[PDB]
Amino acid sequence: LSDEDFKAVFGLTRSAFANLPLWKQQNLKKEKGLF
Structure with a gap:
């Protein structure tokens, strides 16, 4: 997960x-x- 993709998932x-x-x-x- 990239920073932006991660941000899309978690909001952060x-x-x-x-x-x-x-x-x-x-x-x-x-x-x-995400386990």
């Missing part, structure tokens, strides 16, 4: 998402369907 860029707490990251990707 990789750095912005990685800026989040890991539990929320795992939660978000879970909800997105």
